[PDB]
Design a protein around this ligand. Structure first.
Ligand SMILES: N=C(N)NCCC[C@H](NC(=O)CCC(=O)O)C(=O)O
Ligand SMILES: N=C(N)NCCC[C@H](NC(=O)CCC(=O)O)C(=O)O
Ligand SMILES: N=C(N)NCCC[C@H](NC(=O)CCC(=O)O)C(=O)O
Ligand SMILES: N=C(N)NCCC[C@H](NC(=O)CCC(=O)O)C(=O)O
Ligand SMILES: [Mg+2]
Ligand SMILES: [Mg+2]
Ligand SMILES: [Mg+2]
Ligand SMILES: [Mg+2]
Lengths: 369, 369, 369, 369
């Protein structure tokens, strides 16, 4: 089996509602789709949703890094030799996890189809039967956030993720409002997306959150400040999760060494795909750090890849991949059972790509042979 | 696919020559073979060679732990759900890595045969094309050790592993003798198997080894003393490898935290098989610790499993599985190309089991259904 | 004095009521009894109750490790040369503390009978006059646990050990229920048996236990995570006890180095018997760590051995050996004075073995000469 | 069994030759002998040789501490309840290890006689068969030291302990002279008795000792400076032993925590006797610290007690009790087999006290009832 050609599609996934977080607002999500072809006729799909603010990659830079830098050396290689492919990509260029993920995912999709097995079956097998789905509430006035929450509860949701990160006073008001609205049995986690900046502001905020039964506080300080996370952890009993501060094994090593967190948000776009995501899971397990597989809000393609990793590992206890539930159009057909997610047994990523939808969402494309 | 029955065979692999190390001498190697059957008719083989001195497991205790404790709960399970199977075994009993490895290996052999792929292809794919083979010199008079080395050089060997660990003075004499005999181009590594006990004796010995061009010193102190390894590492420039001191992720975490070694000897019998061996490799990689896949001197079955792990990972740079080259009888047919080892592309472990030889070496057996 | 033969008995001690803890439920307790004979006609009894989940030993594996690995080399040795016997067993096989304890206990019983002195008199003499007895409440609905507690109070008990470890919410409810029922003068300690897994869940739970006057929280996290215990200890003022996390001196060294606990639960089955239990006590004393001698729920034989250690050391301030109070049949006759335990002055373990009961509970046996 | 009376004898043991060390010179050794009587007629002997410079105890202060402070509360107690007796002495007065040792030794002598067993048989049993005896060379001109060494070699000695500690230049000259004289096969260890004061002077001295094959350097810096020992250990590969810096478990804890030494010199006079010496051995074993049982140069009584401890523990690898070989008169009859020491099987300390010699060496005495 050899890679014969790689199609690159620069698309834009339209959102039903604006997605608003501490460092940015989104009306749609630019994504790069990879269509990997092989001499045996097997086709694999991969995806890369770049978050400029997190990995230093953009929609346009990812397309070109894939076209000119990463894909050319891949023609002729066997998609199943994943360790080798990742080594080749790493020796070619440092970082660019999102671009690498796009390739990595397509390879696993092909491997699954070739062996007629779901991807999760190839990276450890089925461990989880299902995961609850958590609805993400975009930043807004405390009353609006509480209102959408009540509205989603009627839809079956029992777990919410509150986006905050503008001003401590306001963020606290937002969290208080939602909790009062949904009662105390509804699960709530808070994501600051680096909004509180440092330990001082964070600890001040945490003082007012002790009685709100918050499952965990996600990335309250700037990504690079692992020291601050450790300091905060030494002075609070609320569980702490690192997201932007964790990308590759480089940060995991530091998080483990400094005991900087209770949980980490692993994302295929931050580490380079399925294979490296799995390595991160194994590393976290060693230190007893609870893991979650989150996302940049992606199509059914990357979302599916994320679930396949999550379902195969005991250390991964929660998932956050709801892109297919937020977009008005999707190139894939990943099935959800809100308030739950369960994976079928279809080979590879277990999804079908609607090529008519793909072309429709395509702004520009190319092929590398 | 479901496990329908597990055959257990208590055998003894005869050695051509006595194997002599610091804490024991061996005339043959007791081993437990696992024959895993499935509803689909696929058969998988696993093996467990217990080293009492390292994991607290014996030939007889492993047979019974497998028969009464581990195998019963496995009937009905899918061999491909490896993460799940390992979780079930761990929730059933703590430790007993050798017994768990026997099961783990058979599952991968089945998975490989089922998907018609070599095991290495399922855990990362092919990375290495070959590995040089290192001949192990049993403890003996310096002149005898030097003599066997010269004799093996004529056989094509270019890398040797010296077993020492009786008395510092004598061990140094042994190492000096061999080096003088083989010249300075021949690779030599030294394994003390805990013989020097502590940092004081070790450092005294290292003073006399600086000019002998030794690749690395393996486990000079007692297994449990990780602190001593770190102390020694802080006062020497000779590479240090931990073997007995490393079993599972528990020790890896400590080795990483205390910066206790440059290299680690990963063995399927110490961690519970292929799956956990891979997790250890990923953990070592995070800390930039070079890995080796060694062995307890096993048949073609476990030896093959060890190579499949080694060939799939960039972090594993050397291998030490020569049981098939030391035994006068073997139940498997793993092919070697001394001074090198290369893996074929046959499915599963890629070996055929001679059942006539298996029965011939069997002392007692049983079946669990 | 020389060991002439060792009888091994694989028995099962029937429980009056099911014993239920976080990682398992028990209807009876499998045990291995050792009958050590000497050339002088003195007979000693030892016992090994294996907990698979804690030491990696099973009922069947212990019987065989004793039969094939440990006992053969003991024939001819003097039972009183305990340091030597332990060294011989350790050089023969690593770990297997339960199997080693079985031998160790029989040797002390013989030593006591030979010198016509209680065992405690041989390891430091009498220090304690008595110890209060704590009743262990198996996991159950908060109402059932509170009910049994009230019922046992009527029986004279004034100290209780609550077994929990399913779900933080539920565990807290269980603890609140019992405390409300028994009032605030009754002593209560909580054992999670690793149920809360990590520091995050543990600290969340501890928030709700501050006003319940709990003497100490025992092993809230997984055994191997000593780091987590230290972290928890740095953020709470409730006393912390390590149980499963402590087996031999290897863990004690780490517990002391990381200041991971206030108290430790020493058990003969985890360290290899009386002699090593004493060494652990001496080690704990150096660091000012309070000690307790607990148990796996054993017959009068091992239970007695445990008390003899406890009564001879000032650092051991509490005991947890109630197997004889839980079984419907016992091969020994250890006398209790609920709510207290006091040791008589009879030689050796100070108990008589009813051989008719022994044979009755025996499933299989053998003799090594 | 109860203590009915304690005789105290203030004696002086005459030396054949002056004993000269870094901080003092001795023509004879003042010692306090204890004769413990019991209601059962069993008599036990103990001894306390005080070194003012090490424990803050003198010949006269020890006699009176025993007479007025320690012995009165002991009348009526059972000598075999050693843990209790030590607790009573510790609650009565802090420190004074030498006075406490005198009592402790007599109790064990009685326990041994009562049970008709050697003391070593009561604290672990026989482990060692023999120990080589090391001759101690008092400080003197390099030529005189080398001369006595050659003279003692003719007497069968093969191991020497060089006393130095005046001036680095001179000490180095002394060590060079002896080594040149005896050749390189003779074992030599160096004891500075705090003479080099700090790490700077010590490290300067060590530069010139690297090629002299010295087994270890004993206490080069002032006793209280454990930090200095750790610093020196971090910059040298010569084994380091702490003597004066180690008295009780308080220092052991610190030595272990700071990794300040490779070996420690345990002495009954520094820790309070046999029982606490054993606890120190157990503590050292945990950290893998090699132990030696040294002495203040005592009569056959304390010397015997020291050997009984040494012979019962694997962690104790060398002994330094040669008082009986240095005195012209001794109240005891401990048998030596230079160049070796072996213990007989006589009960208790296994020695007979010549009361005529005792009275002859007595300057003043008293009895407490
Ligand atoms: N810049 C882009 N394109 N995306 C950023 C997403 C933020 C990310 N995901 C979320 O918050 C929702 C994940 C989900 O449910 O799919 C975070 O955890 O912070
Ligand atoms: N007790 C038993 N059965 N085996 C012990 C083997 C020792 C091990 N292997 C070796 O030295 C040789 C590995 C090889 O070449 O297969 C070690 O590295 O120390
Ligand atoms: N698996 C077996 N067979 N036993 C496990 C006992 C648990 C142990 N003992 C107890 O909880 C009661 C101790 C007593 O009272 O004897 C613990 O402390 O966790
Ligand atoms: N002040 C008095 N009374 N004695 C001091 C003896 C010094 C001690 N012993 C010795 O050097 C010789 C031990 C012997 O061989 O018994 C030391 O190790 O430094
Ligand atoms: Mg986030
Ligand atoms: Mg090795
Ligand atoms: Mg417990
Ligand atoms: Mg000294």
């Amino acid at each position: 089996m050899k890679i014969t050609a790689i199609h690159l599609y620069a698309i834009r996934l339209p959102l039903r509602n604006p997605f608003v977080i501490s460092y940015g607002s989104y009306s749609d999500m630019p994504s790069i789709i990879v269509k990997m072809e092989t001499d045996e006729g097997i086709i694999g799909y991969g995806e890369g949703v770049a978050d400029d603010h997190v990995t230093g990659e953009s929609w346009e830079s990812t397309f070109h890094t894939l076209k000119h830098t990463l894909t050319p050396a891949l023609i002729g290689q066997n998609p199943m030799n994943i360790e080798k492919i990742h080594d080749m990509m790493d020796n070619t260029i440092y970082g660019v996890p999102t671009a690498k993920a796009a390739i990595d995912i397509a390879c696993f999709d092909i491997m699954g189809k070739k062996l007629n097995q779901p991807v999760y079956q190839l990276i450890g097998g089925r461990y989880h039967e299902e995961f609850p789905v958590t609805h993400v509430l975009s930043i807004a006035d405390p009353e609006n956030m509480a209102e959408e929450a009540a509205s989603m509860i009627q839809k079956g949701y029992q777990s919410f993720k509150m986006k905050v990160g503008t001003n401590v006073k306001e963020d606290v008001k937002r969290i208080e409002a939602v909790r009062e609205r949904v009662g105390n049995d509804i699960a709530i986690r808070v994501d600051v997306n680096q909004g509180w900046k440092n330990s001082a502001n964070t600890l001040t905020a945490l003082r007012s959150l002790g009685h709100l039964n918050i499952d965990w506080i996600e990335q309250p300080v700037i990504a690079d400040d692992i020291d601050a996370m450790a300091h905060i952890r030494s002075k609070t009993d609320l569980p702490l999760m690192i997201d932007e501060g964790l990308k590759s094994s480089r940060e995991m090593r530091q998080i483990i060494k400094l005991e900087a967190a209770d949980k980490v948000n692993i994302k295929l776009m931050k580490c380079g795909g399925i294979y490296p995501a799995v390595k991160l899971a194994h590393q976290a397990e060693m230190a007893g750090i609870e893991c979650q597989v989150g996302s940049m809000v992606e199509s059914s393609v990357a979302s599916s890849a994320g679930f396949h990793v999550a379902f195969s590992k005991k250390i991964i206890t929660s998932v956050e991949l709801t892109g297919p539930l937020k977009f008005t159009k999707d190139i894939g057909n990943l099935h959800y059972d809100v308030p739950f997610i369960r994976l079928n047994e279809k080979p590879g990523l277990g999804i079908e790509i609607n090529e008519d939808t793909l072309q429709e969402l395509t702004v520009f494309q190319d092929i590398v042979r």
